[PDB]
Write a protein that binds this ligand. Structure first.
Ligand SMILES: Nc1ncnc2c1ncn2[C@@H]1O[C@H](COP(=O)(O)OP(=O)(O)O)[C@@H](O)[C@H]1O
Ligand SMILES: Nc1ncnc2c1ncn2[C@@H]1O[C@H](COP(=O)(O)OP(=O)(O)O)[C@@H](O)[C@H]1O
Ligand SMILES: Nc1ncnc2c1ncn2[C@@H]1O[C@H](COP(=O)(O)OP(=O)(O)O)[C@@H](O)[C@H]1O
Ligand SMILES: [Mg+2]
Ligand SMILES: [Mg+2]
Ligand SMILES: [Mg+2]
Lengths: 7, 371, 371, 371, 7, 7
């Protein structure tokens, strides 16, 4: 992901 | 000519033409690059091995999964994997066959839009489609009502559907999946004495989890039995030849699904998320949702997972309600089978995203059809 | 015209054109100078004999090896040897033929740069290359994966290569080689009594080691049998005409390779170093490294060395792993054969160090191509 | 009487009573055995020297570290070291003083259980404890929130703690440490002319690395400056009196910490692992984790390591967040200082593992208290 | 270690 | 060699 978690 | 379904999973890419009963080619979604010196000249060393070739010689490569947790991260790596699939596995020119792809629910719109753009511009597919994986699993199951637990490799989502009317508000998405279980197995195999750190060693641990791991009916009793010096001790042979012995690690790794607090995750287990998703639906619906539980994903392939989840749900659900869990033997390829069924439907032949439709709305028409 | 390969060993210089199946000229890497007076006039006693001529009349010479432990010590003597080779053995002007050399791993940037400078300035070779000896041995073996044990005369290194990707962190280099074995045989021949102290007598001891010495399958049992007054007693004839009798000394000299503690060396035997180098690679590589062991050099020409090494490794390695040792009959010239193969490759024809590339970076560009 | 803290490191055993501000005795964790003939009779020649005496006469010994990467390998050697400590360094009877130890995180249950068994049976300590080294370092630092980088001689772990609640899922452990840096320095000091192979020569190289080695702020620019024939060239004097000159080797050895690919290790540098461990915690925590970075271990004593890692993390971390690295001058004994602080706490006096609690559950009760 | 790495 | 061993 972009915010929260990686991906 | 004929549509082809390419289910891009988070670790196993499955591709094959529509109408078949099984994927034509299944290879790991791995792109590996050389790590050591290229001393020998003239033998034919490529700059990047993709797919089964990458895993064949993983001892000199740094494998990197383009998809993590159901989201593509390295778009060049995904272009490489898609080209390798289309031109080496199916051995077809993608300029003729419409392509159906699968995406997990509750995913960034940028991901799916960029996927459509790269598949529609770099390649020349006359049409394309993106469908939710659990909907395809429900299609493969042959029914029309039920709650699907598609515990993939990177994601574990849960889409409840009644009479074909999916409820896009009881959809629960969890980030626990096969990759996290493999990482936890790597972390807890250390306790006995084996620490697998490199990516090839991670693949070895994944193989160990695939071969030996299983879910106990009751965790506390199984742990007590294992600690009481019982026969619950299997042996695995590493590629180097030396044999490792696994104690209670082989039923502690898949217990993370029912207890995400093992890896410090706030969310509840898969059984509790399924019960909550069933609860969030209408009251008159769950009479069928309880009795039409559907499983998919090769992670949902642990021995005894069905009985454990049935017991947990029956404990959570009212006592006077029949809880039936459907676990077909083809759970690993259920999403692909459903995709092949859907792509061959006569009614679905109009819901494609044609090139004329794409060229007028840009890489944003993909929101015309969202499940 | 055609490239020529000049493998500069630690006691045997092998030179010849590329494409041939055997070195054209093989002579000892010895530079001898007169030691006694010159009472005879007109006999043409030169001031320095180099090569086979030096060993022909070693009775009045003081032989001095320019290379010790695969490291050039006397650069004037090395220049003399190179000139003698290029102008008497191959009988070709070096200003036209590109030259390929061999250097041990973990060997100087200093001496290798100096060798490049001396061949680019004293001679006018239009191109030059420096390659690791074990890589050339692997080239000659015809395979692309394996672990090479090139036990030369001055050095004994071990370079593991998988799929053409050498791992430059499991390369183990040992200083036990033919010169140290000859010195040990010289020291322990004193037991029965025959003791050789001059350099010509050192050459005699080297000949004795080449002819009679061998490696026992089990050292303790062979030693007990020899001490029990058995038939293990060979005889050698010295140049003057007197016959010496060797008891247990002939199979004790090459036992130093598997037990370096005989001459007070902390390092483990060659079998243990090979096992450690195999274990220092990746886990998925060892399956091929165990079954693709490659031996080269001539201290590996001891009868029964392959069986002893296989037994020791199989004892060290896991029981369920196939251990195969490749000992070609041409082990003595394996490095040169590999060099001839490499210099004739079509792909290698661009990896040369041209004079134009040399004149811009000085005696430091050789680190453009390191194996 | 009073508890004593015995931090068993991977090369430097630190022992001393609780309540003190510095270890009483610090000696290498080395057990040396004679290697040559015992010719002289009547000198009181012991069969095994342990500790400082082993290093005093290392020229005739084969030093062997019982600990490799924070792991006990030779249990007889550790029994010898513990007996030598308790009966020669502290000069106490261990039957009275409870003993506190330190163990790296993600260490085997077998190792820690065997250590507890050997201390409770061979010695008669009325109580014992095993605590994570990073936790003790945080105790010594005087704060309660932060991320500890304890880069010891054998292991380099990273335990993030917020408000006293350590997160046992962002703990990253690396096997790069002072021993691997010393081995790499041995490997690259070859390139100048220094062939350190024996264990005594390994100790000499360790001394060289302790004295001269440092971490450059920018690696590529430092390489350019060193190769441009600049003044970056220090001199060291070997025990035999010969002076060696070191060029770029003295800042390439400790760069392996930030680039483990130098020795063929897939894992990322210490800065990247620290950033990943910070990002593996909760989002609201890193406000304090970035600003409370804590260093420990005397390897973290390289000049300029703090500035280098601050620059690297600031590059990785968001630009609008303050990154502070705490590098106390007592980094070498930070773990022991924290252990002494903890063992003297009034609250900790109940968390001991009493002999009564040990004689009931066997050598497995230690998992009552794991950090 | 027992599997992976030496220790 | 220069340091360690002769060569
Ligand atoms: N026999 C097995 N036992 C346990 N897990 C398995 C088995 N076979 C495959 N898996 C798991 O299946 C996952 C890959 O298939 P799947 O769950 O369909 O996900 P994806 O399609 O995203 O790769 C991985 O997590 C893998 O470890
Ligand atoms: N048949 C043999 N028996 C014993 N030693 C041998 C034999 N053939 C060669 N050697 C030894 O091998 C060395 C020369 O060959 P090699 O090991 O390849 O070294 P180099 O590369 O310096 O020529 C010398 O030590 C020589 O005595
Ligand atoms: N001044 C120094 N410069 C570099 N390294 C040092 C220095 N002082 C100590 N060390 C290193 O510290 C390590 C030993 O202390 P420490 O880091 O606490 O580890 P351990 O307790 O496991 O021995 C060794 O790697 C040693 O080389
Ligand atoms: Mg899936
Ligand atoms: Mg040779
Ligand atoms: Mg420490």
């Amino acid at each position: 992901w972009x915010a929260x978690c990686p991906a | 000519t004929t549509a082809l379904v390419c289910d891009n999973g988070s670790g196993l890419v499955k591709a094959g033409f529509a109408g078949d009963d099984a994927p034509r080619a299944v290879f790991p979604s791995i792109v590996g690059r050389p790590r050591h010196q290229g001393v020998m000249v003239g033998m034919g060393q490529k700059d990047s091995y993709v797919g089964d070739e990458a895993q064949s010689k993983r001892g000199i490569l740094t494998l990197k999964y383009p998809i993590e947790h159901g989201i593509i991260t390295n778009w060049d790596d995904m272009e490489k994997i898609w080209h390798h699939t289309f031109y080496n596995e199916l051995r077809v020119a993608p300029e003729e066959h419409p392509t159906l792809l699968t995406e997990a629910p509750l995913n960034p719109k940028a991901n799916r839009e960029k996927m459509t753009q790269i598949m529609f511009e770099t390649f020349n597919v006359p049409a394309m489609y993106v469908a939710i994986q659990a909907v395809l699993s429900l299609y493969a199951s042959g029914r029309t009502t039920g709650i699907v637990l598609d515990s993939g490799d990177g994601v574990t989502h849960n889409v409840p559907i009644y009479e074909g009317y999916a409820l896009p508000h009881a959809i629960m998405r969890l980030d626990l999946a096969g990759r996290d279980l493999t990482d936890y197995l790597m972390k807890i195999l250390t306790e006995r004495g084996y620490s697998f750190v490199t990516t090839a060693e991670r693949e070895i641990v994944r193989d160990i989890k695939e071969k030996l791991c299983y879910v106990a009916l009751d965790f506390e009793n199984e742990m007590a039995t294992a600690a009481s010096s019982s026969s619950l001790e299997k042996s695995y042979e590493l590629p180097d030849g030396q044999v490792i012995t696994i104690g209670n690690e082989h039923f502690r790794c898949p217990e993370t699904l029912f207890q995400p607090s093992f890896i410090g995750m706030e969310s509840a287990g898969i059984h509790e998320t399924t019960y909550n998703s069933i609860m969030k639906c209408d009251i008159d619906i769950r009479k069928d949702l309880y009795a039409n539980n559907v499983m998919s994903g090769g992670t949902t392939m642990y021995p005894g997972i069905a009985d454990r989840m049935q017991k947990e749900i029956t404990a959570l659900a009212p006592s006077t309600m029949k809880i039936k869990i459907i676990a077909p033997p083809e759970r690993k390829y259920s999403v692909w089978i459903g995709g092949s069924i859907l792509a061959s439907l006569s009614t679905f032949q109009q819901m494609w995203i044609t090139k004329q439709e794409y060229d007028e709305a840009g890489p944003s028409i993909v929101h015309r059809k969202c499940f």
